Design a protein around this ligand. Structure first.
Ligand SMILES: O=C(O)[C@H](Cc1c[nH]c2ccccc12)NS(=O)(=O)c1ccc(Cl)c(C(F)(F)F)c1
Ligand SMILES: O=C(O)[C@H](Cc1c[nH]c2ccccc12)NS(=O)(=O)c1ccc(Cl)c(C(F)(F)F)c1
Ligand SMILES: O=C(O)[C@H](Cc1c[nH]c2ccccc12)NS(=O)(=O)c1ccc(Cl)c(C(F)(F)F)c1
Ligand SMILES: O=C(O)[C@H](Cc1c[nH]c2ccccc12)NS(=O)(=O)c1ccc(Cl)c(C(F)(F)F)c1
Ligand SMILES: [Ca+2]
Ligand SMILES: [Ca+2]
Ligand SMILES: [Ca+2]
Ligand SMILES: [Ca+2]
Ligand SMILES: [Ca+2]
Ligand SMILES: [Ca+2]
Ligand SMILES: [Ca+2]
Ligand SMILES: [Ca+2]
Ligand SMILES: [Zn+2]
Ligand SMILES: [Zn+2]
Ligand SMILES: [Zn+2]
Ligand SMILES: [Zn+2]
Ligand SMILES: [Zn+2]
Ligand SMILES: [Zn+2]
Ligand SMILES: [Zn+2]
Ligand SMILES: [Zn+2]
Lengths: 161, 161, 161, 161
């Protein structure tokens, strides 16, 4: 089933702040804001953890779109191959979720990777979820138009928190 | 000569809807709309199948331009290499035709891949045509300024429909 | 020294038309127009051949910038690697000169590949010049801020025309 | 510790001019101007060398952003891999510092490679500094939100000047 990160890293505070640092030309900013809130909320409603949005400076969870090298040890690689990545809870880069600007992202109304599903998978990592062996789980290692957390996802996040 | 898809998939309804979901900066939207209609019509006039254009939501044939990964298992790969792809008739991704935004497309007045020819080849796949061994056929596996369906193309599409 | 193309292809008419089909965001259109004229003129003043500019349809020498695949059998390849190519005199693609939009081009006032030098090298091919073994020649196989045709370049073009 | 370039190239004049030739869409021009001044000044305050900014033509130190091939023998390579490069003091390309437009650069307020740190490392090369074996040094070979020259950096630059 589900998995966590080596050593079960998790957010230790009752509240975790997040910030959408950069956006994509593929969608309106407000759309990304709403979808990010929804992705967070689907994990959030299952656990004793609260998220607070900030719009400047540093937050526990820094979310953004970027092309190529962007300040961490995992530069993006253009169209295709890697699509996004996120880091387990912790200080610094810990918890951050990055999306490769060189793909095509959609709110479901156009062609593209479904951003809501992608954000839910990545933010799952940002909360401490590893990959699942259950094909129905959002945390399954491979990639949406209509979904919800699977029982395995809920079981895993509740186990961690 | 011509070929179909393994198991002869084809549209079973008298009418098939299509939608141009995303466009290219290389051309005016209306130009893409017209060229898509023409490509469809060249296959359409030869068979008992009708196409209806829609401009929102899902249609049987979803047509669009995209860079990199875009929601299916065949992400685009930047400039060069793969130029486009389309799927045989069926539910979901079936029938869809995608074009790589990282190439240069033309209506024939500039440098670029001839979009009308490319669309006619891809939509051929969207209708259930495989590749032909006849060099004169639009469905020949390799890539326009002035063409029409070859006798092999017509023979194949009529055989399927 | 200099070389021509296998079989000495050359323009057989007294006048050769040319058209700048597509431009680059790196420079003003008029700048590209002027630099192209200058590149042509440096070869032109040495031979009994005249060039006439056209701004629509097809011309003997079609000049343009493009990203990735663009209608011929040599798609561009993104930043780096191939920078441009041109074809020996002849019908169709013959004589055409293409420049990869994924590099940086300059009129000499910024960072970039010197477009005047690049255009002079490519249009050399468009006129029937092959590569030279003389390092001073514009037609040397490898890549400008201040130059003129070398004696080898002049000797070669005059030999062909 | 620190290293210089083979043969200790260095600026021999009391004053060295610099010009920011091209900018990045990632940041305001003035921001790049300020950060470049700061990077120069951190090396400058430690040595008997003065920098003068120019805004046209050629300067000893030409600074700029570029995609792909850009006029030297080291074309950039798209997102990832090489991020930037600079040349040791000397005529022509000597002293120049180039940054790959295909990455993401930041002033520290967004996602991206920290431009101030990157500029300080590259301009270090432009002044004649090689790579250091000291992990605390800005000149360490690998890649920022809050830094200053390390004692090794200062020792090295003072040794050269
Ligand atoms: O997200 C992933 O799993 C992998 C790499 C990765 C990120 N965080 C990790 C934590 C542990 C191990 C690996 C990772 N990125 S990917 O580009 O291969 C990717 C894989 C799966 C999905 Cl669902 C999506 C997306 F973008 F759609 F969310 C992206
Ligand atoms: O269209 C093609 O054949 C191949 C891959 C492909 C798409 N659908 C298929 C169905 C079956 C088998 C392969 C395919 N794309 S390609 O990029 O190699 C390509 C090949 C041929 C042409 Cl004509 C064009 C274009 F874009 F011009 F239409 C593209
Ligand atoms: O122009 C070239 O030689 C090669 C490939 C090529 C084009 N035409 C040819 C005719 C015969 C043989 C090879 C070629 N392009 S390249 O990108 O390797 C290139 C090589 C040299 C120069 Cl000078 C420039 C530029 F762009 F600056 F003009 C480009
Ligand atoms: O800057 C570097 O070291 C290498 C290549 C290089 C440039 N100048 C050199 C002089 C000698 C030897 C190698 C180099 N560029 S890199 O892209 O690998 C790179 C390496 C380290 C840093 Cl810190 C940064 C940046 F951009 F952040 F400044 C870039
Ligand atoms: Ca963090
Ligand atoms: Ca990617
Ligand atoms: Ca479909
Ligand atoms: Ca491609
Ligand atoms: Ca021609
Ligand atoms: Ca290239
Ligand atoms: Ca210099
Ligand atoms: Ca790069
Ligand atoms: Zn990242
Ligand atoms: Zn994952
Ligand atoms: Zn696709
Ligand atoms: Zn095909
Ligand atoms: Zn070409
Ligand atoms: Zn050449
Ligand atoms: Zn450079
Ligand atoms: Zn370095």
């Amino acid at each position: 089933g589900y998995s966590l990160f080596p050593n079960s890293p998790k957010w230790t505070s009752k509240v975790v702040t997040y910030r959408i640092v950069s956006y994509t030309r593929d969608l309106p900013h407000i759309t990304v804001d709403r979808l990010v809130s929804k992705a967070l909320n689907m994990w959030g409603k299952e656990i004793p953890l609260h998220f607070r949005k900030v719009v400047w400076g540093t937050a526990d969870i820094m979310i953004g779109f970027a092309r190529g090298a962007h300040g961490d040890s995992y530069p993006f690689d253009g169209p295709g191959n890697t699509l996004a990545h996120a880091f387990a809870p912790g200080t610094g880069l810990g918890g951050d979720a990055h999306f490769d600007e060189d793909e095509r992202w959609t709110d479901g109304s156009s062609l593209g990777i479904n951003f809501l599903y992608a954000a839910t998978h990545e933010l799952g990592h940002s909360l401490g979820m590893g990959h699942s062996s259950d094909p129905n789980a959002v945390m399954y290692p491979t990639y949406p138009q209509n979904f919800k957390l699977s029982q395995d996802d809920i079981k895993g996040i509740q186990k961690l928190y």
